[PDB]
Design a protein around this motif. Structure first.
Motif, PDB file in Angstrom:
ATOM      1  N   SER A   1       0.903  -1.385  -0.168  1.00  0.00           N
ATOM      2  CA  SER A   1       0.089   0.032  -0.102  1.00  0.00           C
ATOM      3  C   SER A   1       0.799   1.407  -0.036  1.00  0.00           C
ATOM      4  O   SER A   1       0.313   2.225  -0.563  1.00  0.00           O
ATOM      5  CB  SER A   1      -0.854   0.118   1.157  1.00  0.00           C
ATOM      6  OG  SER A   1      -0.352  -0.026   2.549  1.00  0.00           O
TER       7      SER A   1
ATOM      8  N   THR B   1      -6.975  -0.228 -10.382  1.00  0.00           N
ATOM      9  CA  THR B   1      -6.888  -1.465 -10.037  1.00  0.00           C
ATOM     10  C   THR B   1      -6.341  -1.452  -8.546  1.00  0.00           C
ATOM     11  O   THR B   1      -5.381  -1.191  -8.212  1.00  0.00           O
ATOM     12  CB  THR B   1      -5.740  -1.966 -10.916  1.00  0.00           C
ATOM     13  OG1 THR B   1      -6.337  -1.957 -12.274  1.00  0.00           O
ATOM     14  CG2 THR B   1      -5.541  -3.673 -10.667  1.00  0.00           C
ATOM     15  N   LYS B   2      -7.233  -2.091  -7.522  1.00  0.00           N
ATOM     16  CA  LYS B   2      -7.189  -2.015  -5.981  1.00  0.00           C
ATOM     17  C   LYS B   2      -7.789  -3.288  -5.548  1.00  0.00           C
ATOM     18  O   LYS B   2      -8.935  -3.761  -5.854  1.00  0.00           O
ATOM     19  CB  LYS B   2      -7.555  -0.779  -5.648  1.00  0.00           C
ATOM     20  CG  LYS B   2      -6.644   0.322  -5.580  1.00  0.00           C
ATOM     21  CD  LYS B   2      -7.210   1.515  -4.693  1.00  0.00           C
ATOM     22  CE  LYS B   2      -6.241   2.633  -4.578  1.00  0.00           C
ATOM     23  NZ  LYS B   2      -5.077   2.466  -3.456  1.00  0.00           N
ATOM     24  N   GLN B   3      -7.083  -3.841  -4.848  1.00  0.00           N
ATOM     25  CA  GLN B   3      -7.300  -5.215  -3.853  1.00  0.00           C
ATOM     26  C   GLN B   3      -8.504  -4.793  -2.764  1.00  0.00           C
ATOM     27  O   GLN B   3      -8.565  -3.175  -2.648  1.00  0.00           O
ATOM     28  CB  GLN B   3      -6.288  -5.817  -3.135  1.00  0.00           C
ATOM     29  CG  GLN B   3      -5.473  -6.532  -3.865  1.00  0.00           C
ATOM     30  CD  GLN B   3      -4.097  -7.002  -3.153  1.00  0.00           C
ATOM     31  OE1 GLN B   3      -4.278  -8.060  -2.173  1.00  0.00           O
ATOM     32  NE2 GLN B   3      -3.011  -6.558  -3.547  1.00  0.00           N
TER      33      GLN B   3
ATOM     34  N   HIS C   1      -6.514  -2.694  -0.104  1.00  0.00           N
ATOM     35  CA  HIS C   1      -5.952  -1.374  -0.820  1.00  0.00           C
ATOM     36  C   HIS C   1      -7.024  -0.219  -1.061  1.00  0.00           C
ATOM     37  O   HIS C   1      -6.918   0.835  -0.966  1.00  0.00           O
ATOM     38  CB  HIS C   1      -5.088  -1.528  -1.798  1.00  0.00           C
ATOM     39  CG  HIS C   1      -3.765  -2.510  -1.811  1.00  0.00           C
ATOM     40  ND1 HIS C   1      -3.824  -3.737  -1.835  1.00  0.00           N
ATOM     41  CD2 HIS C   1      -2.766  -2.231  -0.891  1.00  0.00           C
ATOM     42  CE1 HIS C   1      -2.611  -4.285  -1.382  1.00  0.00           C
ATOM     43  NE2 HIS C   1      -1.887  -3.118  -0.801  1.00  0.00           N
ATOM     44  N   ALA C   2      -8.308  -0.796  -1.330  1.00  0.00           N
ATOM     45  CA  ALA C   2      -9.395  -0.047  -1.474  1.00  0.00           C
ATOM     46  C   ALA C   2      -9.907   0.554  -0.200  1.00  0.00           C
ATOM     47  O   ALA C   2     -10.050   2.060  -0.004  1.00  0.00           O
ATOM     48  CB  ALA C   2     -10.416  -0.592  -2.148  1.00  0.00           C
TER      49      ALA C   2
ATOM     50  N   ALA D   1      -7.453   3.451   0.785  1.00  0.00           N
ATOM     51  CA  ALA D   1      -7.806   4.525  -0.225  1.00  0.00           C
ATOM     52  C   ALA D   1      -8.869   5.252   0.291  1.00  0.00           C
ATOM     53  O   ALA D   1      -8.856   6.526   0.122  1.00  0.00           O
ATOM     54  CB  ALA D   1      -8.122   4.189  -1.517  1.00  0.00           C
TER      55      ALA D   1
ATOM     56  N   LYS E   1      -8.187  -8.405  -7.857  1.00  0.00           N
ATOM     57  CA  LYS E   1      -8.030  -7.207  -7.988  1.00  0.00           C
ATOM     58  C   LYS E   1      -8.942  -6.357  -9.030  1.00  0.00           C
ATOM     59  O   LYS E   1      -9.194  -6.812 -10.271  1.00  0.00           O
ATOM     60  CB  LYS E   1      -6.556  -6.852  -8.926  1.00  0.00           C
ATOM     61  CG  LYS E   1      -5.330  -7.052  -7.969  1.00  0.00           C
ATOM     62  CD  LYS E   1      -4.140  -6.846  -8.834  1.00  0.00           C
ATOM     63  CE  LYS E   1      -2.996  -7.081  -7.742  1.00  0.00           C
ATOM     64  NZ  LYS E   1      -2.567  -5.956  -6.583  1.00  0.00           N
TER      65      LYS E   1
ATOM     66  N   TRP F   1     -14.083   0.939  -6.632  1.00  0.00           N
ATOM     67  CA  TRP F   1     -14.521   0.775  -5.186  1.00  0.00           C
ATOM     68  C   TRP F   1     -15.454   2.182  -4.932  1.00  0.00           C
ATOM     69  O   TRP F   1     -15.178   3.160  -5.384  1.00  0.00           O
ATOM     70  CB  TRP F   1     -13.153   0.885  -4.410  1.00  0.00           C
ATOM     71  CG  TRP F   1     -12.458   2.118  -4.241  1.00  0.00           C
ATOM     72  CD1 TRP F   1     -12.547   3.278  -3.429  1.00  0.00           C
ATOM     73  CD2 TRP F   1     -11.420   2.628  -5.558  1.00  0.00           C
ATOM     74  NE1 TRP F   1     -11.384   3.941  -3.703  1.00  0.00           N
ATOM     75  CE2 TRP F   1     -10.813   3.737  -4.868  1.00  0.00           C
ATOM     76  CE3 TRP F   1     -10.858   1.730  -6.315  1.00  0.00           C
ATOM     77  CZ2 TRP F   1      -9.981   4.513  -5.723  1.00  0.00           C
ATOM     78  CZ3 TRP F   1      -9.914   2.480  -7.457  1.00  0.00           C
ATOM     79  CH2 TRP F   1      -9.555   3.840  -7.018  1.00  0.00           C
TER      80      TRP F   1
END
Ligand SMILES: *[C@@H]1O[C@H](CO)[C@@H](O[C@@H]2O[C@H](CO)[C@@H](O[C@@H]3O[C@H](CO[C@H]4O[C@H](CO)[C@@H](O)[C@H](O)[C@@H]4O)[C@@H](O)[C@H](O[C@H]4O[C@H](CO)[C@@H](O)[C@H](O)[C@@H]4O)[C@@H]3O)[C@H](O)[C@H]2NC(C)=O)[C@H](O)[C@H]1NC(C)=O
Ligand SMILES: *[C@@H]1O[C@H](CO)[C@@H](O[C@@H]2O[C@H](CO)[C@@H](O[C@@H]3O[C@H](CO[C@H]4O[C@H](CO)[C@@H](O)[C@H](O)[C@@H]4O)[C@@H](O)[C@H](O[C@H]4O[C@H](CO)[C@@H](O)[C@H](O)[C@@H]4O)[C@@H]3O)[C@H](O)[C@H]2NC(C)=O)[C@H](O)[C@H]1NC(C)=O
Lengths: 208, 132, 211, 131
Positions: C44, D24-26, D29-30, D33, D117, D121
């Motif tokens: 991250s 593109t985010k898991q 990771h979202a 964010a 991925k 989101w």
């Protein structure tokens, strides 16, 4: 590129009387990975069987299985293996000989797991072989006085005990048709110090 | 018929012939060296045989033809014959590793690891007979 | 020569203790001057908590350095990737190791405890064995208990997770017990902490020396 | 006091405001964010809220604020509140494992792996009130 040289199984050495040592080399460009065989004595070696297979991950696995003399191995002969490859910078050498040190007879104990919900027609048999030296041991499973295939069971790597000995665990899954035919499963163990005639075994039963 | 003729570099005693080799070799490498010289590692079956060997043996230590198949645990000579006469040192045969046999400068037998490198070994073969 | 290994946290430290830690082990087979330097970073880009560096020189003549980084309970479980950069001055390439939660199917472990009978020459001591099988993923915590309190980790030996004939994994545990232990209380509990274990990540079985 | 004022690049609906991110985010990771944008992953408690989201959500697939601590087994939103209203797809919540929740282009919820991925989101925060 990595190379490994193994010792023969006590079953092939003491029971079958035909021991074999294998040199495994895990690489794969120009795969002319030659395996030279030589004794510390310089005496000639018996014919080796080369077995090369390409794994699913994209690596070439080549094994050379050399036959050795029963009396020659036990008496302390050193067997060397020279591995050469065109892209390799320096030739890899591996040598194996009999583990000369103290001896201890193995302690065999067999166990049967009870019925688990959803698992009726199948049960799991476990066996603990402990307090033996050196680490080299052959673990076998028997049903109806005849041996079961090696793929059917799983034996752990030899780990050191709190004292001086070594320990190995064996796991064998058994079907309903197997215990109903004969409710006896023998756990054989072939070891250097085992007496009499290198055999120590224990019988187990699914619900006796 | 008389058995006394023996080869070059070898010494005669009774109906046998004896060679006393010098050089760093393990028990197994000494056994192969004996075969290369058309003989085998020394086998003692009489106190007369042992007495002759002590007079010519190395003061440091020599290898003999006594061993065990591991399967037996019993000491049996390289030729195949069993032990009838025993000349072991005080405490020997040991059970430390529960092994191979070596001859000391004194002539007594003691257990030793096979991988141990000694500077002496004794070869033995039947002496050739002479016409009557 | 050099090698680097990055571990995952134990389910006991992740689910029970609620304080998980990931360790980066670097075995330097040819120690030399300077130091190795262990960089910590998240996928991250977020900052990392303070790591504890532990360097010991082994008897064989090799330097062993471990960096134990603390991780978040919710952060690990949710799928955060933790990276570790190793940079030795006597090295051409910087070794990178990354670890994250094993995202796949789940299976509750099957615990079976056993006691060995009295062997000649072994009266004041007995051996206790445990089979923990058919569970996924491979990560599992195996513990031994006596008088409702946990026994030290050095007292027992747990095997590496090996695949079963089906889909699950299997682990064996060996614990040697003294005469004074079974005579005070003839009950030994084998606890197993696993991701899919229910209720509250605990599956255990009791065993007795001659019941 | 009226609750309708919302920040730049964010869209207003009821007592909340919503952000629809692209990239593109898991799932994890979202979540990070959303915190970086002074909010959190979307929490749905009424059929009116779900209806608004479907009109602005990505047709490919979007990440939501529903998950399980694994220690629980039941689904609990990022804010801490329990599930009162549920818009699951046919066969969902799937027990393929025994995991995280994503929103389809249709608006229905389905169980997905955390390491998957996705390119979208949804962030959510309380709307600021006006005198
Ligand atoms: C691609 O996939 C293949 C598998 O399909 C992987 O290959 C395996 O690689 C590992 C590691 O290189 C191999 O493991 C080694 O096995 C040796 C032999 O084990 C058995 O050998 C014969 C069986 O034919 C038996 O007679 C014998 O008793 C053994 O059961 C071991 O000797 C090796 O151990 C050595 O190192 C350890 C420390 O790590 C020491 O403790 C030991 O004493 C010893 O010195 C080792 O475990 C494995 O065999 C390979 N599999 C096959 C099928 O060949 C590739 O690695 C993989 N590629 C990648 C990139 O991951
Ligand atoms: C000199 O002597 C020292 C010992 O004193 C030797 O060091 C050992 O080296 C081996 C191999 O490098 C190390 O083994 C590795 O351990 C890793 C971690 O294991 C535990 O780590 C922590 C404990 O703190 C736990 O949280 C965790 O759950 C583990 O129980 C493993 O991850 C490694 O596995 C990986 O490699 C093997 C192949 O080697 C693969 O088969 C695996 O799949 C995996 O990818 C590995 O087992 C060992 O930890 C070292 N010991 C110590 C005390 O540090 C030196 O090697 C020796 N020198 C020489 C020349 O022999």
């Amino acid at each position: 590129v990595s190379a490994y040289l193994s010792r023969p199984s006590p079953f092939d050495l003491f029971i079958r009387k035909s021991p074999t040592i294998t040199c495994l080399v895990v690489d794969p460009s120009k795969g002319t990975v030659q395996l030279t065989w030589s004794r510390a004595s310089g005496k000639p070696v018996q014919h080796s069987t080369r077995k090369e297979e390409k794994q699913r991950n994209g690596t070439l696995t080549v094994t050379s299985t050399l036959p050795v003399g029963t009396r020659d191995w036990i008496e302390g002969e050193t067997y060397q293996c020279r591995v050469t490859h065109p892209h390799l910078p320096r030739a890899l050498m591996r040598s194996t000989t009999k583990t000369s040190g103290p001896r201890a007879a193995p302690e065999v104990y067999a166990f049967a797991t009870p019925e688990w919900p959803g698992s009726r027609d199948k049960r799991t048999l476990a066996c603990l072989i402990q307090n033996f030296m050196p680490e080299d041991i052959s673990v076998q499973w028997l049903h109806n006085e005849v041996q079961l295939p090696d793929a059917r069971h799983s034996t752990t790597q030899p780990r050191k005990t709190k004292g001086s000995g070594f320990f190995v665990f064996s796991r064998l899954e058994v079907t309903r048709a197997e215990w109903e035919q004969k409710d006896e499963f023998i756990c054989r163990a072939v070891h250097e110090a085992a007496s009499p005639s290198q055999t120590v075994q224990r019988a187990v039963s699914v619900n006796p | 018929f008389v058995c006394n003729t023996c080869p070059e570099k070898w010494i005669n005693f009774q109906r046998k012939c004896y060679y006393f080799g010098k050089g760093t070799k393990q028990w197994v490498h000494a056994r192969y060296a004996c075969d290369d010289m058309e003989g085998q590692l020394v086998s003692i079956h009489s106190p007369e045989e042992q007495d002759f060997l002590t007079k010519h043996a190395s003061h440091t230590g020599s290898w003999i033809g006594l061993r065990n198949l591991d399967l037996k645990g019993e000491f049996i000579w390289v030729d195949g014959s069993h032990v009838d006469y025993s000349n072991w040192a005080p405490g020997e045969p040991t059970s430390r590793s529960q092994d191979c046999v070596m001859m000391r400068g004194s002539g007594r037998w003691n257990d030793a690891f096979c991988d141990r490198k000694l500077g002496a070994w004794v070869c033995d073969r039947l002496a050739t007979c002479t016409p009557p």
